[PDB]
Amino acid sequence: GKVKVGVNGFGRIGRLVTRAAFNSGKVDIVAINDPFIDLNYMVYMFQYDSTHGKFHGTVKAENGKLVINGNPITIFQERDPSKIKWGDAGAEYVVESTGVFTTMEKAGAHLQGGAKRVIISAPSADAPMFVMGVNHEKYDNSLKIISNASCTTNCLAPLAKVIHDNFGIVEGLMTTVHAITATQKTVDGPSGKLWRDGRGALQNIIPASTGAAKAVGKVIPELNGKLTGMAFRVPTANVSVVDLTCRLEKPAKYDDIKKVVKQASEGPLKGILGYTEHQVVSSDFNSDTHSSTFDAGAGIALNDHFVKLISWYDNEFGYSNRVVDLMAHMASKE
Amino acid sequence: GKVKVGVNGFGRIGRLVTRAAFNSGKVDIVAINDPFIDLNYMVYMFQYDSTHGKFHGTVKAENGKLVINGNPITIFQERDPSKIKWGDAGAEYVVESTGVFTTMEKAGAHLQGGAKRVIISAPSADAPMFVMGVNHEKYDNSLKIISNASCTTNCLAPLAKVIHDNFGIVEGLMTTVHAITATQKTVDGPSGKLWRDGRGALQNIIPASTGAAKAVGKVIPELNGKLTGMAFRVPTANVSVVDLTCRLEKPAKYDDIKKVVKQASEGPLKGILGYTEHQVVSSDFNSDTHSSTFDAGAGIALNDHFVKLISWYDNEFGYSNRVVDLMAHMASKE
Amino acid sequence: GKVKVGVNGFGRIGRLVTRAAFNSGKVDIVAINDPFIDLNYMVYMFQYDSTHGKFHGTVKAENGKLVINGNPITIFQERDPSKIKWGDAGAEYVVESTGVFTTMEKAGAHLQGGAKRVIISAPSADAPMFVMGVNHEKYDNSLKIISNASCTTNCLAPLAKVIHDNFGIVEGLMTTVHAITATQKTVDGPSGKLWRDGRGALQNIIPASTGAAKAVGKVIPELNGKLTGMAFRVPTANVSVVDLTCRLEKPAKYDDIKKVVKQASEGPLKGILGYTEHQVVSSDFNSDTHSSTFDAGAGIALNDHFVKLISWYDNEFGYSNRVVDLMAHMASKE
Amino acid sequence: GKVKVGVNGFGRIGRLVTRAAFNSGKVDIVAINDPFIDLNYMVYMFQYDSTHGKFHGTVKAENGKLVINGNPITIFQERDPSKIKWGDAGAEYVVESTGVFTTMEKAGAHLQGGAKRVIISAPSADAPMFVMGVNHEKYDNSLKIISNASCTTNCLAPLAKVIHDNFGIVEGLMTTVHAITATQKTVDGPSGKLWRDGRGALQNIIPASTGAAKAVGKVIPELNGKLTGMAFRVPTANVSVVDLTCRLEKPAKYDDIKKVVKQASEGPLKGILGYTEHQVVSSDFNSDTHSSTFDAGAGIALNDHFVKLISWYDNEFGYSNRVVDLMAHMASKE
């Protein structure tokens, strides 16, 4: 009884969500909409990936349909989201991943096309936010338009939940070293509002502002107004790292922090929060499906009330698998 | 009696042409047109460069004009080239560098605005092509719309001219290892016609097709139909290299080739064609104003009639300085 | 009846040969010698790889032995190759991969330790060279010390064999765009003999001299004295590309070249020489086991007697799998 | 009355110290010692630089001496530091930059050769540490062997001095995003003690441990035991950034922090501590001689008592110029 999923947009997030859905098998993709990509170019884009390698399976085109592993997928080329016929394609849930329809009113145009529920794979101004393993039990089936937050928020949340539940985070500041994305420029180029983001991504470090640490306070209501941070965008390909500097209410040695993080990663947060003690680097987490992996040896503690914790996350795969897991939990709640 | 130059477009080529014109002092920039860049963003773009460093001088904004080294520059934000008032700004020559007006009819819209002559900084389908030091004596002042060719053609033409004049190139094939440009994508992205150019520029090698070796036959009419080639776009920043494999009519040892190339680089082609015998690499030619520099130690000869020659070129600076030099020679011919 | 293989040196070639031997299952690794790597560091090196990802299997240390997939491996830390006890470890063949014992006299010290045959994974001055699929039928079991040539030679050989057999290569030059290796320097550093190789590998293009195209004439005796070339070392990670410019004796259109290369890649050279018509880039050949893959769309022909052909090769995996395949064919000939 | 300086070692630090000494003119280099670099290779190394470009001046070899700008330099090739004849070469101060003689006993071997004072360009276990602009007034001429600390400490010190003097740092944590160095490996390689440092520098992020934040407490005695941190080594070329998260005793808005940092950068710490409000990136600080530049727009404050400050530093140039400035202040105190 798997749900039927349509995907709006065939960018990086849409292709990786389709790849995660075909790898895991939790949901079924039945429709893809993109106005600027044709069918053969869709075959070429899905088959070959510079970061995650070739697709393990068969992908081709037949009768105007995209056939992946023997499953045909209807292709739409509509630009207006209210004109996409999701209903006759059989799609029940719609993943909005273009990054330009993030409000409730803009993403609600998909409901006119026959879709039941819309999941935004981006931060939203007014839609409710859900992070898997932290507050996903708060979903109550009467919400039609929700938001899965972002990759950085998905990495920071579970981690901050365990530390807050065991030791009481008083205040903290986060820094993330982030890999390049699609919005950056190969060489110095014109960025309208963010002047730093228009500089050459290959040659530069590029400090940037982010709101994921503030969105943790939306995800965890007890931490509202206690977290903030910024980011650095370094010239790597896929893997990012989060560094959280926090002050604790209760005394906590580093071995106690390691023990409670390992215990959380084993039982309750299995598959969402990881734990390692090896001498790992960034490329050791390529195509890793965890939201965040705690690096025990990389962190440092100044005293019993002031620590800095290090975590890793694949901002492409882990996030797409969280979209699939959230969609599966949504389908189980009907 | 320096000519007055307007620049259409403030991309990489336009900014580097303005920088070369202010560094050399051969011409005077009096006007810049760009519809998507405002004045303060123009100040920020011209002041800071990731590749060539900070501008040696003063740049600011005063009374709606861009003041560089005390010289004010009028700024236009028109989109239609026929609506730009080049005449009241005092601009006599116009450098068309946007890359979208390359035909004679499209680039002739600048003549309606009061411009006298238009120089296209791109290959053109029907405008006459000129390369400095090779065929620039063929300019006869009755041509209004001409094309300066491209960086690769400017690198290949002087070396091919010297080798053909001394030994008689029978046929040849060229390969260029090229640095990234602006049209590439930081990560796998959607390229309409060129599917290979949409892949991630940081992770890939990306073979590509080019018409520069064919345009050498337009520049040198005796070599028509004797040259062709392709290119590779590797993840470096600025400097490219040309590798020419050719068959000669007359016997030629490698020392004779080195002698005639050095003698050409000293007297006739001084400043256009360089010569080195040191153990150089690509970053040794950053901000070098030569069109091409012959690497004596990097080439190899199989026999007396079959050689492979290696040359270096900064595809940003050398080319912009050639645009300025062509404009100066055009102004001297009036 | 698989042969027992010892590996001398745990560098990049030795680890990739061990990985290919455990992935394919054609031979059995029973011993590894390295004087500067201990057992736990060997576990860490074999488990984690930046280029080819994590090892698919189990690797650990037990009772002073390296246990991979339940198979224990004896570890030696001897420096003198004549003092390694290969015989009591059960090793019959020895892969010499340190890169410092390449002559027959230096690599013959392994025969004193009880080894039967020595395979050098490097070009050799006086040992016979063999390339799989080209001249591997010339092995006659009375040779104790042979050489498997190099990755570039393994890519160029089969390709040049097909073109020479079908159209008669008169003369040809080769250029290879090569990924960075271990001998390069992260930043400008001191290289004793090769001054260009001491420059910073991340920032530079670095022309270099190579002898693989000359070693093709040793592998194919009819092409002796007809091939030469050089190389460029660009800042990528794993995949290299070979560009061969040649003159043919018989007339050959490009479709005929494509047809004979595809026919060779299907029947006789299956698994050694590949063929593609897609719009591929370098990262599409990561962890590909082919020696060379012909890129049909990337090449160009000037006329019927002067062509340039493009081929891809993973210089790490394909070469190690060729070492394993040569060892298996050697074991079958006893 | 400039002092005579000998340099031990011609690595990155030694060459950049020689370049800074010839650019600034504060001291005179009279001797260079290196056992593995000959004279012509020294000419090649000093003339060409991938990061900072070609040397602005003349460098050649004459009569066994290295002639830079008409100044001859004696060359030694001794390995034992006690066997170098610094005295007959006229050298009064000696910069120990090889990185292997950092204790007082090991670096005191240069005093047997006729040197007066030894400056170690590295952190030292028992030699006194001095940072220019912070505690350089504590030098008292009776010390023979001192240490100039490290680049990270030189960036963090002045900044922490101003914040501690104006607002009273209670405790703080530091993270630095550092460019690749010489100790890293182009590809996965064998690192004896630091297993993470042996991984491929081009592909990885590589968390690492550092002691510069602890050495600030040696430089500023009131901050002893209040600072600690770690580092990340990203694949860029030259410029690093320091990220300091601290808790303040007195209330401080961000505008007050900006005001006191700008006032410190103008008057007392001119040339040592910089200040900017532009939208800068890392390559804007290439060849910048400041120890640290405060980025006003990149930092963030959670409340009045918990801030995160961002600063930039060229870890190659700024540090070498600090070595020259410390040597000049040492020479003025005689």
UniProtKB/Swiss-Prot annotation, chains A, B, C, D:
The modification Deamidated asparagine is found at N8, N63, N69, N148, N154, N224, N315. It comes from Homo sapiens (Human). NAD(+) binds at R12, I13, D34, R79, S121, N315. The modification S-nitrosocysteine is found at C151, C246. S-nitrosylation of Cys-151 leads to interaction with SIAH1, followed by translocation to the nucleus. S-nitrosylation of Cys-246 is induced by interferon-gamma and LDL(ox) implicating the iNOS-S100A8/9 transnitrosylase complex and seems to prevent interaction with phosphorylated RPL13A and to interfere with GAIT complex activity. ISGylated. It holds the Pfam family Gp_dh_C. SUPFAM superfamilies: Glyceraldehyde-3-phosphate dehydrogenase-like, C-terminal domain, NAD(P)-binding Rossmann-fold domains. The [IL]-x-C-x-x-[DE] motif is a proposed target motif for cysteine S-nitrosylation mediated by the iNOS-S100A8/A9 transnitrosylase complex. A motif ([IL]-x-C-x-x-[DE] motif) lies at residues 244-249. It is found in: Cytoplasm, Cytosol; Nucleus; Cytoplasm, Perinuclear region; Membrane. This is Glyceraldehyde-3-phosphate dehydrogenase. Its EC number is 1.2.1.12, 2.6.99.-. Changing W195F: Increased free radical-induced aggregation. The modification Methionine sulfoxide is found at M45. The modification Phosphoserine is found at S82, S121, S147, S150, S240, S311, S332. One of its GO terms (cellular component) is extracellular exosome.
